[PDB]
Design a protein around this ligand. Structure first.
Ligand SMILES: C=CC[N+]1([C@H]2C[C@H]3[C@@H]4CC[C@H]5C[C@H](O)[C@@H](N6CCOCC6)C[C@]5(C)[C@H]4CC[C@]3(C)[C@H]2OC(C)=O)CCCC1
Lengths: 113, 120
């Protein structure tokens, strides 16, 4: 769609126990009039469904390790992954829910060395 | 325990239709919605649409209007997605997930395990 919000992600093999940050930019602000910023982060491990890591830009989902943290401005976003483990391997996606259609970034692969 | 259980993988012929299901349990089905996501082999995620069985509200990505039809059966807590006029571009894993309410909670918090569709 010509008017859809476009989300771009950066590209990163990560050494186990080190750290990476993944960044995500949106073509429009994801801060809504209610004061919330509708940006999600997901991890899709190989052969698994995507897992919600962060929602509302900075709220960690239930069950998610505190190794993951989300921050951002409304147009630029970062997922910090501390002490990277084998279970972190997969593709990370950010997604906006501020406007229809909902749209995803193209994904950032993480592989372990 | 919230669970979304999807129907088994399918092989389909070009030009056919298929109907994928997503059975919800462990919560009040009609208090939330169901949303569907496509992943083509080796590729990213795409949002298809959402359905809220209580109000019947739907929203679709224009890309999938008239490819995908979303329905829901409140009597069995099951959401369905029918895909018509199949082509090789429709080969993907299709996921269902929960959709939430105003305030942004419960959006994509639980997912089905995905249904692989292969169009021959
Ligand atoms: C914050 C703004 C972002 N948007 C809104 C849009 C909001 C929806 C508008 C339409 C509503 C119809 C439905 O009948 C409602 N009932 C279901 C049964 O129970 C009582 C409520 C909830 C409903 C689906 C809303 C839920 C929250 C919705 C997705 C909001 O999105 C989020 C992520 O919160 C705006 C456009 C894109 C999404």
């Amino acid at each position: 769609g010509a008017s859809d919000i476009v989300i771009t992600q950066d590209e990163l093999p990560v050494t186990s126990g080190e750290s990476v940050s993944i960044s995500c930019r949106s073509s429009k602000s994801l801060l809504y009039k209610d004061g919330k910023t509708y940006l999600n982060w997901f991890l899709q491990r190989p052969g698994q469904s995507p897992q919600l890591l962060i929602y509302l830009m900075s709220t960690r989902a239930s069950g998610v390790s505190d190794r993951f943290s989300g921050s951002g401005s409304g147009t630029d976003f970062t997922l910090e992954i501390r002490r990277v483990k084998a279970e972190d391997v997969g593709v990370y996606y950010c997604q906006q829910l501020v406007e229809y259609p909902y749209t995803f970034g193209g994904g950032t692969k993480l592989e372990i060395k | 325990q919230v669970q979304l259980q999807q129907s088994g993988a399918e092989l389909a012929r070009p030009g056919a239709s298929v109907k994928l299901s997503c059975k919800a349990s462990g919560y009040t089905f009609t208090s939330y919605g169901i949303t569907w996501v496509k992943q083509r082999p080796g590729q990213g995620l795409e949002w298809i649409g959402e359905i809220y069985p209580r109000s019947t509200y739907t929203s679709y990505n224009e890309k999938f209007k008239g490819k995908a039809t979303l329905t829901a059966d409140k009597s069995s807590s099951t959401a369905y997605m029918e895909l018509r006029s199949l082509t090789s571009e429709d080969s993907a894993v299709y996921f269902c997930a929960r959709a939430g309410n105003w305030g942004g909670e419960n959006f994509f918090d639980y997912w089905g395990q995905g249904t692989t569709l292969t169009v021959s």
